[PDB]
Design a protein around this ligand. Structure first.
Ligand SMILES: C[C@@H](NC(=O)c1c[nH]c2ncc(-c3nn(C)c4cc(F)ccc34)nc12)C(=O)N1CC(C#N)C1
Ligand SMILES: [Cl-]
Ligand SMILES: [Cl-]
Ligand SMILES: [Cl-]
Length: 279
């Protein structure tokens, strides 16, 4: 049931690509008659020992997570460890928002925000820091239902600590991650703020997190991009209000980007502030 035999995975195509892996559309087809279910299967690429041990942790985390707003674990395949997950054909929210922009109103973006916030509230209850929350890592189950995916960089908080010192794009990172490699549930709140930005810009590439920040951080100097972003964030620079973003939603974004981790709201606090907008 939870064990998928390698030789019955029929490879269709590649869904998405990570730094140390890919997610492939496969049909698990034991009967050989093409009646089997389509599934999304992660395998490692360009992998050394460190990424292998990370993958073993990631499988166990995903396996232990049970939420309507978190992508479902199906099983694993050995032979060559592979992680089998539910296939959501509508794909990722990043592509979905660009594709269906003309039909997706503010109220629907708020639905997605609220569901992501719930998933993130659930993650915090399991003491799990996602570390790579972004629109590219949210999947569409239906028009009115999204789920958090990609637990490849996810860390369980130690039982006696609410932070972890430990690479995704720097433009979703909290200042304390940028500066001291510190990650926490409130580091995820910083990222969620950027996700809210993505939603309300419909993931338009002309005003993406990187496009906005890259423009702020000058042409070039003998200074790395990381230091210059940290400098701007310490000067109080933030992503702007998206075109036609509701005032109140932009204000929630700014609360997610409070300099101090303890001054950012909890997902539990954010949830009702998202749901009660416009009611
Ligand atoms: C975001 C993650 N996707 C998953 O974990 C998925 C689990 N079930 C899925 N069902 C569908 C998809 C997916 N479909 N389509 C059309 C996509 C297009 C994309 F750009 C990304 C993901 C998908 N991804 C998934 C992914 O693509 N990667 C993690 C990295 C690794 N390894 C690459
Ligand atoms: Cl087929
Ligand atoms: Cl199917
Ligand atoms: Cl579906």
């Amino acid at each position: 049931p939870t064990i998928f035999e390698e030789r019955h995975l029929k490879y269709i195509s590649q869904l998405g690509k990570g730094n140390f892996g890919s997610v492939e559309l496969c049909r698990y087809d034991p009967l050989g008659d093409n009646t089997g279910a389509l599934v999304a299967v992660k395998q490692l690429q360009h992998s050394g020992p460190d990424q292998q041990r990370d993958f073993q942790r990631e499988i166990q985390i995903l396996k232990a997570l049970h939420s309507d707003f978190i992508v479902k674990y199906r099983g694993v395949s050995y032979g060559s460890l592979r992680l089998v997950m539910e296939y959501l054909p509508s794909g990722c929210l990043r592509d979905f928002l660009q594709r269906h922009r003309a039909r997706l109103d503010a109220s629907r973006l708020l639905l997605y925000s609220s569901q992501i916030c719930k998933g993130m509230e659930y993650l915090g209850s399991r003491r799990c820091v996602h570390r790579d929350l972004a629109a590219r890592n949210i999947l569409v189950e239906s028009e009115a239902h999204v789920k958090i995916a990609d637990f490849g960089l996810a860390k369980l908080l130690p039982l006696d600590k609410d932070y972890y010192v430990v690479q995704s794009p720097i433009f979703w990172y909290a200042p304390e991650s940028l500066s001291d490699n510190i990650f926490s549930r409130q580091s995820d709140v910083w990222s969620f703020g950027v996700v809210l930005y993505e939603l309300f810009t419909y993931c338009d590439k002309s005003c993406s997190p990187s496009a906005e920040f890259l423009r702020m951080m000058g042409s070039e100097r003998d200074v790395p991009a990381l230091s210059r972003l940290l400098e701007l964030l310490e000067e109080g620079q933030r992503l702007p209000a998206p075109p036609a973003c509701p005032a109140e939603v932009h204000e929630l974004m700014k609360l997610c980007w409070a300099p101090s981790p303890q001054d950012r709201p909890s997902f539990s606090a954010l949830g009702p502030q998202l749901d009660m907008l416009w009611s």
